[PDB]
């Protein structure tokens, strides 16, 4: 049992810091010694014990695209998480509403947050809730650049019988199979979240669920064996070829759903030239489709 080096310090996170509002919870905090604002998330302790997801942002927070940790706090009680304030609002949520979007901007920003999670499932780790409100931006500049993805606390890291952290890749040691067989329908949900991404943000709508109100049995009707739409209205003046790729990211079956590493092997995504630089026709309520969103992820979580 190796030694896990975890808070129990003099300083504490109210010196260094102080909370105001809010945004385990989240809240805007203030570096007191240089008046810089930042974000911390209280976990409890009696509840969570957040030992693997800080593992995850220690070491994975480095990554340009994941939200970055800038410190961690442990008063014995409560675990404080600092992270890096996101000043660009939700993601999906700026990009419906602007008038002006198109493919080509949608292709950039699929693989701007694909790319980073073909990283993180070839070191063994699934995000397990990749839905929308999780990705967001840290600034407005409009970059793919600017795009993090936040909210670890349910992410896994693939590890053996032994305890030891294990890669997809090098299989020597023993891992249960139940293990590496949920460590694969975990990395096709996460997957399957970026396909209702792109679906949302093609169309304006999400695709299993209209507004907060849809019964989640409906809900889990349709994102059943039930098929979705991908013709017709909004898709019309959609290109062929990003519907293709679409289909083959919500695949109901887990073993044909597509892989990251596919994913990014797209022609959609590695011709991005090839696609429509218009304005796409797509509904506009996102607020609606932020109803949907929890809506649909309700019914999958209970
Ligand atoms: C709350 C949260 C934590 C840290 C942040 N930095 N900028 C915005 C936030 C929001 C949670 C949510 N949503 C979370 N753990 O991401
Ligand atoms: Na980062």
């Not at 190796?2 to 109210?14: E, M, Y």
């Not at 949520?93 to 701007?112: G, H, Y």
């Not at 959609?238 to 597509?258: E, G, I, Y």
């Not at 590695?270 to 609606?288: C, E, G, I, K, T």
Request: with cysteine; glycine share 6%; hydrophobic share 35%.
């Amino acid at each position: 049992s190796i030694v896990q080096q975890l808070h129990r310090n003099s300083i504490q996170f109210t010196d260094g810091y102080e909370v105001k509002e809010d945004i385990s919870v989240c809240k805007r905090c203030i570096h007191k010694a240089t008046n810089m604002e930042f974000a911390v998330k209280i976990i409890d302790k009696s509840k969570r014990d957040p030992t693997e997801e800080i593992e995850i942002l220690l070491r994975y927070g480095q990554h340009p695209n994941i939200i970055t940790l800038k410190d961690v706090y442990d008063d014995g009680k409560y675990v404080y998480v600092v992270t890096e304030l996101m000043k660009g609002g939700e993601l999906l949520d700026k990009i419906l509403r602007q008038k002006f979007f198109s493919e080509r901007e949608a292709s950039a920003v699929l693989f701007t947050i694909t790319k980073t999670v073909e990283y993180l499932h070839a070191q063994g780790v699934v995000h397990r809730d990749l839905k929308p409100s999780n990705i967001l931006y840290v600034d407005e500049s409009g970059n793919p650049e600017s795009i993090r993805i936040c909210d670890f606390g349910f992410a896994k890291q693939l590890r053996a019988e032994n305890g030891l952290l294990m890669t997809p890749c090098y299989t020597a040691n023993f891992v249960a199979p139940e293990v590496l067989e949920r460590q694969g329908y975990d990395a096709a949900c996460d997957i399957w979240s970026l396909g209702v991404l792109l679906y949302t943000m093609l169309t304006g709508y999400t695709p299993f669920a209209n507004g907060p109100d849809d019964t989640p049995e409906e809900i889990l009707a349709r994102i059943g064996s039930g098929k979705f739409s991908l013709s017709g209205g909004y898709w019309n003046s959609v290109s062929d070829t990003a519907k293709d790729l679409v289909s083959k990211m919500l695949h109901v079956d887990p073993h044909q759903r597509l892989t990251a590493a596919l994913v990014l092997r797209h022609p959609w995504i590695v011709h991005w030239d090839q696609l429509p630089q218009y304005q796409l026709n797509r509904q506009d309520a996102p607020h609606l489709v932020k109803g949907a969103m929890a809506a649909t992820y309700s019914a999958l979580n209970r």
